[PDB]
PDB file of C-alpha atoms and ligand atoms in Angstrom:
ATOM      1  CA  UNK A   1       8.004  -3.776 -11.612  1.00  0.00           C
ATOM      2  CA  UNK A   2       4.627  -5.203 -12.116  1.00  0.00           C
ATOM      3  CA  UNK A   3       3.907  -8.269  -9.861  1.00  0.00           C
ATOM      4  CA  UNK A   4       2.093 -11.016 -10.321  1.00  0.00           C
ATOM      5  CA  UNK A   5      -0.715 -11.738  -7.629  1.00  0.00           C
ATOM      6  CA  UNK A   6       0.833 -14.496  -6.032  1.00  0.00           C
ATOM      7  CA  UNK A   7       4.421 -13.067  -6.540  1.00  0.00           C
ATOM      8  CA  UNK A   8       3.093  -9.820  -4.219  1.00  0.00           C
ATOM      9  CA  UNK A   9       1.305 -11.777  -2.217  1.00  0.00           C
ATOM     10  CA  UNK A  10       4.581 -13.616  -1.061  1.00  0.00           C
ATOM     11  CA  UNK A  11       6.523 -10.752  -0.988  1.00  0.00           C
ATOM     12  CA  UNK A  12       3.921  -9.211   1.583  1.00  0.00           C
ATOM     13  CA  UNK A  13       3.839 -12.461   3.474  1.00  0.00           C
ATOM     14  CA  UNK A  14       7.742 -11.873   3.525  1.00  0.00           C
ATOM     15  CA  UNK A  15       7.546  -8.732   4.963  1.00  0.00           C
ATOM     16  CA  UNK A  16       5.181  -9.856   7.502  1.00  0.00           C
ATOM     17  CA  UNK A  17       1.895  -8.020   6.877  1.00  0.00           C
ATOM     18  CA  UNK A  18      -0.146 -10.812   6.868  1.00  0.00           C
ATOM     19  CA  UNK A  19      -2.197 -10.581   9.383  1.00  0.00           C
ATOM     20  CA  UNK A  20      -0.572  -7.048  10.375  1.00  0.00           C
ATOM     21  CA  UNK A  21      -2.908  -4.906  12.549  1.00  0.00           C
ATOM     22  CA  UNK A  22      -5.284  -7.873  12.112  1.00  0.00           C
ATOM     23  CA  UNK A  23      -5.120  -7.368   8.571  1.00  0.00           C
ATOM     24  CA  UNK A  24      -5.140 -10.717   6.768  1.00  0.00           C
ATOM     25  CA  UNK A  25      -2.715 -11.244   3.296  1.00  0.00           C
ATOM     26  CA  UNK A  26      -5.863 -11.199   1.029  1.00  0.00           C
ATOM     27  CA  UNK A  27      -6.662  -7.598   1.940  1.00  0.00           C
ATOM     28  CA  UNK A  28      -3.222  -6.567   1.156  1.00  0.00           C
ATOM     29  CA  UNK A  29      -3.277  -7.757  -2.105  1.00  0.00           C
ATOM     30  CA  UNK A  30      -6.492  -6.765  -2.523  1.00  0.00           C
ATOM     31  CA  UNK A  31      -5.690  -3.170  -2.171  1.00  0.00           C
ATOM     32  CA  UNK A  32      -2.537  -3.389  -4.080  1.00  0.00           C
ATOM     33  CA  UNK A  33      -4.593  -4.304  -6.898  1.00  0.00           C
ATOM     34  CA  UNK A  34      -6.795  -1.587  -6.723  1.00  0.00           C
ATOM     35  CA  UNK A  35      -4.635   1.230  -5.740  1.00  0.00           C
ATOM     36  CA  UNK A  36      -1.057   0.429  -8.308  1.00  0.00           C
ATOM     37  CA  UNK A  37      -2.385  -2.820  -9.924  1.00  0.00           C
ATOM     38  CA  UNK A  38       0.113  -4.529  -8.817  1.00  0.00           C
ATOM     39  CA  UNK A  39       2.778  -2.208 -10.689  1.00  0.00           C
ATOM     40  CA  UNK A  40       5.611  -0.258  -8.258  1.00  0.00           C
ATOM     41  CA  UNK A  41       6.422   2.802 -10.239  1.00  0.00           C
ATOM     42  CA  UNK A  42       2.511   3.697 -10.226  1.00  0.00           C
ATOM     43  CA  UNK A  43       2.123   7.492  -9.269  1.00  0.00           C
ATOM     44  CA  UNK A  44      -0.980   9.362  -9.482  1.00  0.00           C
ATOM     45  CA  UNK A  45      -1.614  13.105  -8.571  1.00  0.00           C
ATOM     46  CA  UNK A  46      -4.231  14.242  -5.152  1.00  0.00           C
ATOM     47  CA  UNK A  47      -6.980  16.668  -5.720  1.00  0.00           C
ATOM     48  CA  UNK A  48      -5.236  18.541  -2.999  1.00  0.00           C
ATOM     49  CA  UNK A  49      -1.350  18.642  -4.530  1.00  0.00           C
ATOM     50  CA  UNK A  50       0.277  15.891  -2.454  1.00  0.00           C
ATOM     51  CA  UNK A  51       0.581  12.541  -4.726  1.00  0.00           C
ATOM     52  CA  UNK A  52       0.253   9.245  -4.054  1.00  0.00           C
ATOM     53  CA  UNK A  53       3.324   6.471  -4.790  1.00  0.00           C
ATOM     54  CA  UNK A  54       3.443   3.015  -4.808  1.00  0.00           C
ATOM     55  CA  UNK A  55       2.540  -0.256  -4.935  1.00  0.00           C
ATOM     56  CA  UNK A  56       0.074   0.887  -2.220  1.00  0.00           C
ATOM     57  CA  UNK A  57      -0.352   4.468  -3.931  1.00  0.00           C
ATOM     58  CA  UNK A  58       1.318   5.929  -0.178  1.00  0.00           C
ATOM     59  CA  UNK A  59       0.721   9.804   0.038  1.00  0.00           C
ATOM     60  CA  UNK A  60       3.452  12.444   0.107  1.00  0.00           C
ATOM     61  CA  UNK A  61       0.433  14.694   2.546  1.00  0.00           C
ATOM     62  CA  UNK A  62       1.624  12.685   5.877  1.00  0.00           C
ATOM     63  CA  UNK A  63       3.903   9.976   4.724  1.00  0.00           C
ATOM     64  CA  UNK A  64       6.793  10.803   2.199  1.00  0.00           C
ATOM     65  CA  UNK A  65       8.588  13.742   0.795  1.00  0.00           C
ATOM     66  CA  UNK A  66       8.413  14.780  -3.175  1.00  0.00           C
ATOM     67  CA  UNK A  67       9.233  18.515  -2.726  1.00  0.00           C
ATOM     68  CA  UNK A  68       6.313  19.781  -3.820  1.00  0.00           C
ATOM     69  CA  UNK A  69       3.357  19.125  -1.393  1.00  0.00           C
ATOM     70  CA  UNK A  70       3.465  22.532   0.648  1.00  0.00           C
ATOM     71  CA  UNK A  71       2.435  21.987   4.372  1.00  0.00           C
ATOM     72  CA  UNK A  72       3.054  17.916   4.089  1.00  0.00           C
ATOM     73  CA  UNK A  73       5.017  15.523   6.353  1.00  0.00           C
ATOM     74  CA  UNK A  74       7.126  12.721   5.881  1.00  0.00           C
ATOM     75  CA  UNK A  75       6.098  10.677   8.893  1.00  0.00           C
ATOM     76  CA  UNK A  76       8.404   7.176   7.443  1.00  0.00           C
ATOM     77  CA  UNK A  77      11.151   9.634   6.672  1.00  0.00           C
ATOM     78  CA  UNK A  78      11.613   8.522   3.147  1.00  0.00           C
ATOM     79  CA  UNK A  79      12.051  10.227  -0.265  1.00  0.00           C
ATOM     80  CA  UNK A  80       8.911   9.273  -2.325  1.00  0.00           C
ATOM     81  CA  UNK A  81      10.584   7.946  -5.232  1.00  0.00           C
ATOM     82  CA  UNK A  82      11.741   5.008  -2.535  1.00  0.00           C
ATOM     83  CA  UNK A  83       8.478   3.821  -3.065  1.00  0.00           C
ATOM     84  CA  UNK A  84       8.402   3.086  -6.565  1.00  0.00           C
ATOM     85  CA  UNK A  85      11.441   0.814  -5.946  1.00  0.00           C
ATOM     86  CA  UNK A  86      11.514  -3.070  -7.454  1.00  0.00           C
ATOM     87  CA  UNK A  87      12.206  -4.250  -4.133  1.00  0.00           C
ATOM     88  CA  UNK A  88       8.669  -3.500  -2.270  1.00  0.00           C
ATOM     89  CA  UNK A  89      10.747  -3.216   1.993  1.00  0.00           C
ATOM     90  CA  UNK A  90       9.881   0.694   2.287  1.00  0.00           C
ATOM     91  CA  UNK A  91       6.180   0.367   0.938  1.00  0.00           C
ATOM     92  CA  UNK A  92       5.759  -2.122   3.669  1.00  0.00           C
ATOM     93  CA  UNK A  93       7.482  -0.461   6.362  1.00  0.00           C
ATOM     94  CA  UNK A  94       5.403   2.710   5.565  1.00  0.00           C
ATOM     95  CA  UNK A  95       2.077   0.576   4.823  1.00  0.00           C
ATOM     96  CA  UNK A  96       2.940  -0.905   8.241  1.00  0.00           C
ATOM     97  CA  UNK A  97       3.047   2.974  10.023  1.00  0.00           C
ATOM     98  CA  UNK A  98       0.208   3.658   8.517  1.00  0.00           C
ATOM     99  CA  UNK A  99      -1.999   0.924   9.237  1.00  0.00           C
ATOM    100  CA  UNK A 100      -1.287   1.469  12.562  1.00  0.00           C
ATOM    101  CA  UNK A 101      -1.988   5.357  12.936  1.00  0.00           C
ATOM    102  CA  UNK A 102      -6.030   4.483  14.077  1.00  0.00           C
ATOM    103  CA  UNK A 103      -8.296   4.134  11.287  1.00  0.00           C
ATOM    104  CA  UNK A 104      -6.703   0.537   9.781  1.00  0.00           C
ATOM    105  CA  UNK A 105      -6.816  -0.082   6.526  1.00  0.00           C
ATOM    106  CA  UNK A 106      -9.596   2.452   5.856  1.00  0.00           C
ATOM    107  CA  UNK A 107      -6.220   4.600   5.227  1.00  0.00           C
ATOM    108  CA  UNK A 108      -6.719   3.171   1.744  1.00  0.00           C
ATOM    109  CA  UNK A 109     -10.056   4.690   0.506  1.00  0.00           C
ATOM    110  CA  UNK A 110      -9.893   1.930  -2.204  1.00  0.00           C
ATOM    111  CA  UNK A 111      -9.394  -0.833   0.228  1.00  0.00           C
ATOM    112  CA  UNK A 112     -12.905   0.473   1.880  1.00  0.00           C
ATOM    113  CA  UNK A 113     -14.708   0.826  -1.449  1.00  0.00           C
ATOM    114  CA  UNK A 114     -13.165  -1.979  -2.925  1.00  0.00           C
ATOM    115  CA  UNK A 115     -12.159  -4.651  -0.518  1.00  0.00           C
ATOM    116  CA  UNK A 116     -13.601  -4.291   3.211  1.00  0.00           C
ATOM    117  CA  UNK A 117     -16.058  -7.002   3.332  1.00  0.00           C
ATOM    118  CA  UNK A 118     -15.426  -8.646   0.651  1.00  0.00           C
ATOM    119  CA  UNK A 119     -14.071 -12.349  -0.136  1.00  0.00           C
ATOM    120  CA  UNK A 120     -10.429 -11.125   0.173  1.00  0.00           C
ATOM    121  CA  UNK A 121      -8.948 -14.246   0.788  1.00  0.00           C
ATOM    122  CA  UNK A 122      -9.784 -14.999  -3.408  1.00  0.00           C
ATOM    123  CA  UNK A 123      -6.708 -12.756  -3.967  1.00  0.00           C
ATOM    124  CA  UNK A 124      -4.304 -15.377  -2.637  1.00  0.00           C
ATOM    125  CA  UNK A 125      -6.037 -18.263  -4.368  1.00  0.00           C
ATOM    126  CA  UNK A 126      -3.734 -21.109  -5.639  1.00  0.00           C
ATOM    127  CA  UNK A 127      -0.269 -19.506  -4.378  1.00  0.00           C
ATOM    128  CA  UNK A 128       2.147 -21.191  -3.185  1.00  0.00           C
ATOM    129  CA  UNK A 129       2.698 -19.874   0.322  1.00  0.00           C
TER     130      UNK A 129
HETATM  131 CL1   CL B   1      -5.011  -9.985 -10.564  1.00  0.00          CL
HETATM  132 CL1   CL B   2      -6.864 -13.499   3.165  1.00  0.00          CL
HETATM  133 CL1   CL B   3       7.051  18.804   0.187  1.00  0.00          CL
HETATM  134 CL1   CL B   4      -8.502  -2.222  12.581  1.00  0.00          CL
HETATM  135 NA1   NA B   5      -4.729   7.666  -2.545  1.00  0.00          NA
HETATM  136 NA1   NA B   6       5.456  15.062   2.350  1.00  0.00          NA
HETATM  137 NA1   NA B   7      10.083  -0.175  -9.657  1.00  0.00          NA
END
Protein backbone atom coordinates (compact mmCIF):
# COMPACT_ATOMS: atom_id res chain seq x y z
CA UNK A 1 0.00 0.00 0.00
CA UNK A 2 1.20 3.45 -0.60
CA UNK A 3 -0.17 6.02 1.96
CA UNK A 4 -0.97 9.23 1.70
CA UNK A 5 0.83 11.70 4.22
CA UNK A 6 -1.97 12.42 6.27
CA UNK A 7 -3.47 8.85 5.88
CA UNK A 8 0.11 7.52 7.66
CA UNK A 9 0.22 10.11 9.74
CA UNK A 10 -3.16 8.96 11.38
CA UNK A 11 -2.42 5.58 11.26
CA UNK A 12 0.83 6.35 13.39
CA UNK A 13 -1.16 8.59 15.66
CA UNK A 14 -3.39 5.35 15.96
CA UNK A 15 -0.79 3.30 16.97
CA UNK A 16 0.39 5.72 19.43
CA UNK A 17 3.85 6.87 18.31
CA UNK A 18 3.24 10.27 18.48
CA UNK A 19 5.17 11.53 20.77
CA UNK A 20 6.74 7.90 21.44
CA UNK A 21 10.19 8.07 23.13
CA UNK A 22 9.62 11.85 22.87
CA UNK A 23 9.35 11.47 19.32
CA UNK A 24 6.70 13.83 17.96
CA UNK A 25 4.16 12.52 14.79
CA UNK A 26 6.00 14.84 12.29
CA UNK A 27 9.26 12.93 12.67
CA UNK A 28 7.54 9.74 12.05
CA UNK A 29 6.24 10.68 8.97
CA UNK A 30 9.08 12.35 8.17
CA UNK A 31 11.16 9.29 8.13
CA UNK A 32 8.57 7.20 6.53
CA UNK A 33 8.90 9.40 3.69
CA UNK A 34 12.38 9.13 3.34
CA UNK A 35 13.07 5.60 4.14
CA UNK A 36 9.68 3.61 1.99
CA UNK A 37 8.02 6.85 0.69
CA UNK A 38 5.25 6.18 2.21
CA UNK A 39 4.82 2.70 0.29
CA UNK A 40 4.65 -0.76 2.68
CA UNK A 41 5.99 -3.40 0.40
CA UNK A 42 9.30 -1.17 -0.02
CA UNK A 43 12.43 -3.52 0.42
CA UNK A 44 15.85 -2.54 -0.28
CA UNK A 45 19.10 -4.67 0.10
CA UNK A 46 22.20 -3.64 3.12
CA UNK A 47 25.73 -3.29 2.03
CA UNK A 48 26.29 -5.92 4.63
CA UNK A 49 23.48 -8.77 3.43
CA UNK A 50 20.71 -8.12 5.96
CA UNK A 51 17.77 -5.98 4.16
CA UNK A 52 15.73 -3.50 5.21
CA UNK A 53 11.54 -3.81 5.08
CA UNK A 54 8.98 -1.52 5.50
CA UNK A 55 7.23 1.38 5.71
CA UNK A 56 10.13 2.32 8.05
CA UNK A 57 12.74 0.22 5.87
CA UNK A 58 13.20 -2.10 9.54
CA UNK A 59 16.41 -4.33 9.22
CA UNK A 60 16.45 -8.13 9.18
CA UNK A 61 20.48 -7.54 11.06
CA UNK A 62 18.72 -7.12 14.71
CA UNK A 63 15.06 -6.89 14.09
CA UNK A 64 13.31 -9.49 11.73
CA UNK A 65 13.98 -12.77 10.12
CA UNK A 66 14.26 -13.25 6.05
CA UNK A 67 16.44 -16.42 6.10
CA UNK A 68 19.18 -15.14 4.62
CA UNK A 69 21.08 -12.61 6.86
CA UNK A 70 23.75 -15.08 8.46
CA UNK A 71 24.61 -14.05 12.12
CA UNK A 72 21.23 -11.70 12.40
CA UNK A 73 18.51 -11.55 15.10
CA UNK A 74 15.00 -11.14 15.16
CA UNK A 75 14.68 -9.07 18.31
CA UNK A 76 10.38 -8.31 17.50
CA UNK A 77 10.16 -11.97 16.66
CA UNK A 78 8.53 -11.45 13.35
CA UNK A 79 8.95 -12.85 9.80
CA UNK A 80 10.10 -9.86 7.62
CA UNK A 81 7.58 -10.09 5.05
CA UNK A 82 5.09 -8.98 8.18
CA UNK A 83 6.38 -5.78 7.54
CA UNK A 84 5.39 -5.13 4.16
CA UNK A 85 1.78 -5.80 5.31
CA UNK A 86 -1.27 -3.15 4.31
CA UNK A 87 -2.10 -2.93 7.80
CA UNK A 88 1.12 -0.92 9.26
CA UNK A 89 0.54 -2.74 13.61
CA UNK A 90 3.97 -4.80 13.34
CA UNK A 91 6.06 -1.85 11.74
CA UNK A 92 4.97 0.09 14.72
CA UNK A 93 5.38 -2.37 17.31
CA UNK A 94 8.95 -3.01 15.96
CA UNK A 95 9.58 0.89 15.22
CA UNK A 96 8.44 1.19 18.85
CA UNK A 97 11.41 -1.60 20.14
CA UNK A 98 13.61 0.04 18.33
CA UNK A 99 13.26 3.50 19.20
CA UNK A 100 13.66 2.52 22.48
CA UNK A 101 16.98 0.35 22.31
CA UNK A 102 19.27 3.86 23.21
CA UNK A 103 20.16 5.82 20.31
CA UNK A 104 16.27 7.17 19.40
CA UNK A 105 15.43 7.76 16.25
CA UNK A 106 19.04 8.06 15.04
CA UNK A 107 18.18 4.15 14.43
CA UNK A 108 16.99 5.58 11.12
CA UNK A 109 20.17 7.00 9.43
CA UNK A 110 17.68 8.85 7.11
CA UNK A 111 15.72 10.32 9.91
CA UNK A 112 19.29 11.93 11.09
CA UNK A 113 20.28 13.08 7.60
CA UNK A 114 17.00 13.93 6.62
CA UNK A 115 14.76 14.97 9.42
CA UNK A 116 16.55 15.67 12.94
CA UNK A 117 16.30 19.31 13.20
CA UNK A 118 14.29 20.05 10.80
CA UNK A 119 10.60 21.63 10.60
CA UNK A 120 9.04 18.13 11.05
CA UNK A 121 5.88 19.18 12.17
CA UNK A 122 5.29 20.42 8.05
CA UNK A 123 4.72 16.66 7.47
CA UNK A 124 1.40 16.67 9.31
CA UNK A 125 0.26 19.96 7.82
CA UNK A 126 -3.54 20.27 7.11
CA UNK A 127 -4.56 16.62 8.44
CA UNK A 128 -7.24 15.99 10.03
CA UNK A 129 -6.16 14.59 13.38
CL1 LIG B 1 4.58 13.69 0.74
CL1 LIG C 1 5.35 17.09 14.60
CL1 LIG D 1 18.57 -15.11 8.76
CL1 LIG E 1 15.93 10.30 22.37
NA1 LIG F 1 18.22 1.17 6.48
NA1 LIG G 1 17.29 -11.44 11.24
NA1 LIG H 1 1.45 -4.03 1.65
Amino acid sequence: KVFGRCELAAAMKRHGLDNYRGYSLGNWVCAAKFESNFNTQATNRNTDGSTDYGILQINSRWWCNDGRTPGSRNLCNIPCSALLSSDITASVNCAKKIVSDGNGMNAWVAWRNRCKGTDVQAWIRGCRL
